[PDB]
Amino acid sequence: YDRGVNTFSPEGRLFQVEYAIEAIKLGSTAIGIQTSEGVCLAVEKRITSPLMEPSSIEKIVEIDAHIGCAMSGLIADAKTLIDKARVETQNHWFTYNETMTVESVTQAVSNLALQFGEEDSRPFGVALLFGGVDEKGPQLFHMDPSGTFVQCDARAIGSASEGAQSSLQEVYHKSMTLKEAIKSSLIILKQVMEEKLNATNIELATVQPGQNFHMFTKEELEEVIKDI
Amino acid sequence: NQYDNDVTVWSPQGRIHQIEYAMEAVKQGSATVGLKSKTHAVLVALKRAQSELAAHQKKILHVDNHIGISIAGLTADARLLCNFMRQECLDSRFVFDRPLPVSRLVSLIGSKTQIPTQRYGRRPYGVGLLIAGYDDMGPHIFQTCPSANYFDCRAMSIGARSQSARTYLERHMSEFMECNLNELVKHGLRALRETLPAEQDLTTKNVSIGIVGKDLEFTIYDDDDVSPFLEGLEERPQ
Amino acid sequence: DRKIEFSLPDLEGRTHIFKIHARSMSVERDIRFELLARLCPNSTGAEIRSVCTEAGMFAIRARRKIATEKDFLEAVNKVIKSYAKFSATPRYMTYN
Amino acid sequence: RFSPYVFNGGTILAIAGEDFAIVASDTRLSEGFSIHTRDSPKCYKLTDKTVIGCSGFHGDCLTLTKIIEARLKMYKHSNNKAMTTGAIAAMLSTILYSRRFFPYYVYNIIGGLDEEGKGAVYSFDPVGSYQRDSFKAGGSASAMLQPLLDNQVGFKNMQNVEHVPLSLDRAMRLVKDVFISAAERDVYTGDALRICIVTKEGIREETVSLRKD
Amino acid sequence: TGYDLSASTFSPDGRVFQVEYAMKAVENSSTAIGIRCKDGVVFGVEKLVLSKLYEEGSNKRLFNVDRHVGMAVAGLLADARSLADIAREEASNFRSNFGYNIPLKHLADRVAMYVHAYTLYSAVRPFGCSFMLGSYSVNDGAQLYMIDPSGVSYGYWGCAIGKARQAAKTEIEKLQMKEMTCRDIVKEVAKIIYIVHDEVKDKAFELELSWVGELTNGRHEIVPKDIREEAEKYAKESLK
Amino acid sequence: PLLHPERFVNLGIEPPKGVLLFGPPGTGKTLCARAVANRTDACFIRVI
Amino acid sequence: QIHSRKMNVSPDVNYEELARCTDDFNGAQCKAVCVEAGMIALRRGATELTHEDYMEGILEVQAKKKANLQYYA
Amino acid sequence: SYDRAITVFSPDGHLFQVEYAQEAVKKGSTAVGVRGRDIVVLGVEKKSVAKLQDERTVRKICALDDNVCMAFAGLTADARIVINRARVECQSHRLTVEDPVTVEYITRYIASLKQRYTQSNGRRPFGISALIVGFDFDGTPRLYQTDPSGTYHAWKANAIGRGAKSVREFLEKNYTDEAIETDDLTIKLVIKALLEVVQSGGKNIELAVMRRDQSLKILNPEEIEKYVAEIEKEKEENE
Ligand SMILES: Nc1ncnc2c1ncn2[C@@H]1O[C@H](COP(=O)(O)OP(=O)(O)OP(=O)(O)O)[C@@H](O)[C@H]1O
Ligand SMILES: [Mg+2]
């Protein structure tokens, strides 16, 4: 009874979506931290080849001009979720002349991830981190293949997910600043990855209230790493 | 064990096991308690944390100005029934220009959940809805089940270890019809504290209380306004 | 009367197991073990000890008397990755 | 043969204040050369900060009002907040264009407060184009009210007169004077005057009688 | 047995066990009896209280299909609710197409053919319900029908559905039902319920009595035996 | 029960007398049997 | 109820409520629930039993355990 | 154990039927491709004519539009559907939007058409991998690649087919950060890369270049024989 999305267990449960949570584990790590000054975000690349072009590997995509994103797990299912998440923020501005809030973005995203066998296919294999600054300030959210949606203050997913969480709960507090949280985030990264941390293994993305631009760092990232 | 695969297949004992397994998904969720007086119906739920610093998952959600529901079970079947619930509430406002009677809205749910418990191709809805409402004849407390049966009741507790909450409600149900909201709410949340392990306490960050009244619209209080309700309580006799 | 079953240690179990089977061997005094417990997802206590014995065997392939970090990293590929996966490692580009 | 449209009359007035908004209308419902009732106001309290007025064909006014009130609830449970004044005018433009080839015979004016606490008046057409104005007058007596408010509010065609902003009390007597002069020359206007005042403290109402002929 | 999975397959001796399995699921439900006098039909349902929090009139098994037609279901209660809505919908189309009340002989045929259709395909299962149909008219008198999960539907003078199907009809047939009035029937139905296992190995119960005939002028409604309480006063005297 | 045979009787329970160990191989079945032979202070019988 | 004669049972326990959740057991597994529930209360040093103490003793017979399964809110 | 379905997961989170489609790519002839300063180049190996057939119907290199090329692997049947479909999209894009089609746009169409073709049961996925090379998007040379899972991706030098691991390891020690100007030098890099063929017969190489302004220029087995001669001229310095 463990090969069907249309079949329960004697105890609970699935037994199909539980296997979809396991598909996240073989991804790459990603850390996002919510701070009152804004939301920073970090990820690991895992570049395989030197001939492999680096900017064709995306981990941070721009959903909107005040909302970033992060992903892990299956790359093939991720590009489907990013597509409508750009469209649903665009349909909302067309009919309301306003920016869709960061919480209500994922409401539209979770409404299709819970449609895998509930029409009249398989569940997805990708967890997502959504950071953005809406009218309620900076926000940071998190979802899963099971459509379970929640708000987090600082979250780390992918591979090395549980090992990051124990060290990440140690140093977080409410009165952080943005420039403190950036250098606090990649102390965790060089302790959980196996290669030496340089300017080519990672990439950053921030968002601020008055600086809704710049969900990327372009070789100012070299300044942060050299002062670790 | 070969009969334990589909909803269509009957058993040689006459019991379909797939409906019997969807009851077990209700026991995975946390406990929640609903009750009512002559004038006021209050349902109280219990939040559960995911991690040490994520937000707690919400349980009570607004539906209409005279209807609010609780939840226990799958979150996939939760919002799928909510979107069916909200669509039927505004159709009577658009057509009949009256609010729905609460007793006949739940009969639409039992017709809704009956088809995926008979036809192949869709599992039953793993869900534990508690319903409070106001028709023209006072408050109501309803529960549903994944076997598509709906039970009218005056007090009910479902979820994890909710049997100990039922024992508190049976020996205090004679007191519920007369008392008002200053103790009727804290008659209810004295029943949640037996569904807890005996070392931690019901704090302000893990509980939600929703009140709909005869002259009061359905209102959800959480995490800031629970403090006028948690005042004036005794501890557990330890 | 009692059905005690044994399962695989999640992460905190394995990080304690590496500190058991590698405390009595000449290693570098600055390495971390939590990175090693990542790379053994579905492994047993026997497989963890086989990694600890194999990493010292690479030190005798070279001429050393202490174990480095890359001694263990090659030992994980020798024990697990030489038998657990061969299609997912080169043709990996579905997951990053 | 069957014709689907008829004219019912009505007159709607809105003035955007500095920190307020005033919406006024008559309560006369007529058709042809008959009076259906003398008590049918055109004001509709959408939210606590937004009042809409609907003139024209009365069957479409009852339909379009109930569609907007449904979508207010559909916005809220999807977003955990209420709509703004400018969000309703953006939503209404898509609803009016959605029946482009069978149009609503309704003239619409939305008045209310913005997110800064100032007045805002949006005027409409039966197909769905809009703009933000300071004062508009829609309905059957629309031509009899726009030139006078250009003199008093807009200070047009005046010489050696300072531009003092309109106070609340001065704006009340300007509304009470234009409907007396309009009910004399127009036949689709009279029998009452419902006035709604939208401020930061709620919505007030006031009724002034007119001539009953 | 293995050759008993689908409802569209035959056994090597020639019967469908999926229909046979659903029949004895009705057997585990509590007893509901039906009886008709010379000028009416009287229903009666033994219904047990679940624990204590039941609110005295919930989830009843005495439905109301038409102006003069009601049901006396037993078995899976949720499956009977969906089946009752079919009979409500079927009687409405007969009104809209013919302009008068549905005859009970024609109504039971339309329902039993609908129950029959769920016993043929492998996609759906047979129902797990059995029920009663009682009505009264001035051109047809009183009738009483009976529908199994297989779809066989024909008329009785008295019946029982539940555990005590045989144990109730033993003492139904010792009544002179051809000439009694349906006010004297009501005090006689209540003793048939209370003889056979009302709360002996069970916990508690509550009696429901539905009612249709000449005294109601064709209407179908519950008894006024909350008024004067005479059913329990007359049946509890049969202790010895 | 071999070191405190009191709290079982002084509450009114009885200890179980048979324990099976099951699971994947190489998980530590023999270790738990090998370690209780160290700290037993009692008769212990391996059975081939 | 027979094998629970010799222990401190708090008198809010219905054995009919236990027969709701216990199914397809023989007589010896019913004895095994009664033995294991006495030791679960011994873990936290409880002095009497409860209905929750039996429910964990039920899952121990077929050797089950429960987590936070993150589907169930 | 459990695969036999494209919708089921493994207990450790895998799609084996998707992973088995990449195993069918390794039965194909190798094809390499690099980008340069102005001239992009791609070559294929393993012609192996069989003495009795016409060789103009066994072509592995086709053009989708006027300034984009194509090289593939896998099995020949599934490539013909993807090629014929991509010619329609790179022509219907020009009708709806009057620009020429960029090299990035056509690779997202091939990947997304292979994406939804993997999700539904009873639809066997394409067992091909493709190389899209085009210096079309405003004078900029680019080359991408595909995958049977449906992941379009960009390299700077690529190898596929039966023996891609040796060639991709060869080019990492050979592709200089010094950009290969004097584009016959860049063509000689491919012939040196294709010199590590499965048999290296010399006359089994079909190199096709593009000077980013003209059309496709299929090389003849007399100009390519001249480039094979100068590769042996540089090999004389070993003694
Ligand atoms: N939890 C653990 N902690 C430390 N070492 C362990 C653990 N589990 C296994 N080992 C190591 O693995 C080796 C083999 O384990 P062992 O043979 O006892 O497993 P087993 O389950 O008894 O095998 P089998 O099931 O085949 O009898 C032991 O020598 C021990 O050093
Ligand atoms: Mg062993």
UniProtKB/Swiss-Prot annotation, chain B:
It is found in: Cytoplasm; Nucleus. The modification Phosphoserine is found at S107, S174. There is a cross-link at K112, K205 (Glycyl lysine isopeptide (Lys-Gly) (interchain with G-Cter in ubiquitin)). Glycans are attached at S107. It holds the Pfam family Proteasome. GO terms for molecular function: lipopolysaccharide binding. GO terms for biological process: immune system process; negative regulation of inflammatory response to antigenic stimulus; proteasome-mediated ubiquitin-dependent protein catabolic process. SUPFAM superfamilies: N-terminal nucleophile aminohydrolases (Ntn hydrolases) (SSF56235). Induction: Induced in breast cancer tissue (at protein level). Up-regulated in liver tumor tissues. Gene3D superfamilies: Glutamine Phosphoribosylpyrophosphate, subunit 1, domain 1 (3.60.20.10). Component of the 20S core proteasome complex involved in the proteolytic degradation of most intracellular proteins. This complex plays numerous essential roles within the cell by associating with different regulatory particles. Associated with two 19S regulatory particles, forms the 26S proteasome and thus participates in the ATP-dependent degradation of ubiquitinated proteins. This is Proteasome subunit alpha type-1. It comes from Homo sapiens.
UniProtKB/Swiss-Prot annotation, chain E:
InterPro entries: Ntn_hydrolases_N, Proteasome_alpha, Proteasome_alpha-type, Proteasome_asu_N, Proteasome_sua/b. Keywords: Acetylation, Cytoplasm, Host-virus interaction, Nucleus, Phosphoprotein, Proteasome. Belongs to the peptidase T1A family. The modification Phosphoserine is found at S238. Gene3D superfamilies: Glutamine Phosphoribosylpyrophosphate, subunit 1, domain 1. The modification N6-acetyllysine is found at K52, K201, K225. The 26S proteasome consists of a 20S proteasome core and two 19S regulatory subunits. The 20S proteasome core is a barrel-shaped complex made of 28 subunits that are arranged in four stacked rings. The two outer rings are each formed by seven alpha subunits, and the two inner rings are formed by seven beta subunits. The proteolytic activity is exerted by three beta-subunits PSMB5, PSMB6 and PSMB7. Interacts with AURKB. Interacts with CDKN1A. Interacts with MDM2 and RB1. Interacts with the C-terminus of TBXA2R isoform 2. Interacts with DNAJB2. (Microbial infection) Interacts with HIV-1 Tat protein. PROSITE patterns: PROTEASOME_ALPHA_1 (PS00388), PROTEASOME_ALPHA_2 (PS51475). GO terms for biological process: proteasome-mediated ubiquitin-dependent protein catabolic process. Induction: Down-regulated by antioxidants BO-653 and probucol. Up-regulated by bacterial lipopolysaccharides (LPS) and TNF. Its main location: cytoplasm. It is found in: Cytoplasm; Nucleus. It comes from Homo sapiens. SMART domains: Proteasome_A_N. This is Proteasome subunit alpha type-3.
Curated annotation (Swiss-Prot), chain F:
Monoubiquitinated by RNF181. Phosphorylated. Dephosphorylated by UBLCP1 which impairs PSMC2 ATPase activity and disrupts 26S proteasome assembly. This is 26S proteasome regulatory subunit 7. Component of the 19S proteasome regulatory particle complex. The 26S proteasome consists of a 20S core particle (CP) and two 19S regulatory subunits (RP). The regulatory particle is made of a lid composed of 9 subunits, a base containing 6 ATPases including PSMC2 and few additional components. Interacts with NDC80/HEC; this interaction is detected only during M phase. Interacts and SQSTM1. Interacts with PAAF1. Directly interacts with TRIM5. (Microbial infection) Interacts with HIV-1 Tat. Component of the 26S proteasome, a multiprotein complex involved in the ATP-dependent degradation of ubiquitinated proteins. This complex plays a key role in the maintenance of protein homeostasis by removing misfolded or damaged proteins, which could impair cellular functions, and by removing proteins whose functions are no longer required. Therefore, the proteasome participates in numerous cellular processes, including cell cycle progression, apoptosis, or DNA damage repair. It is found in: Cytoplasm. Belongs to the AAA ATPase family. ATP binds at G23, P24, P25, G26, T27, G28, K29, T30. It comes from the Eukaryota.
From Swiss-Prot, chain G:
Component of the 19S proteasome regulatory particle complex. The 26S proteasome consists of a 20S core particle (CP) and two 19S regulatory subunits (RP). The regulatory particle is made of a lid composed of 9 subunits, a base containing 6 ATPases including PSMC3 and few additional components. Interacts with PAAF1. It comes from the Eukaryota. The gene is PSMC3. Belongs to the AAA ATPase family. It is linked to Deafness, cataract, impaired intellectual development, and polyneuropathy: An autosomal recessive disease characterized by early onset of deafness, cataract, severe developmental delay, and severely impaired intellectual development. Patients later develop polyneuropathy of the lower extremities, associated with depigmentation of the hair in that area. Signal peptide: none annotated. Sumoylated by UBE2I in response to MEKK1-mediated stimuli. It is found in: Cytoplasm; Nucleus. This is 26S proteasome regulatory subunit 6A. The modification Phosphoserine is found at S10.
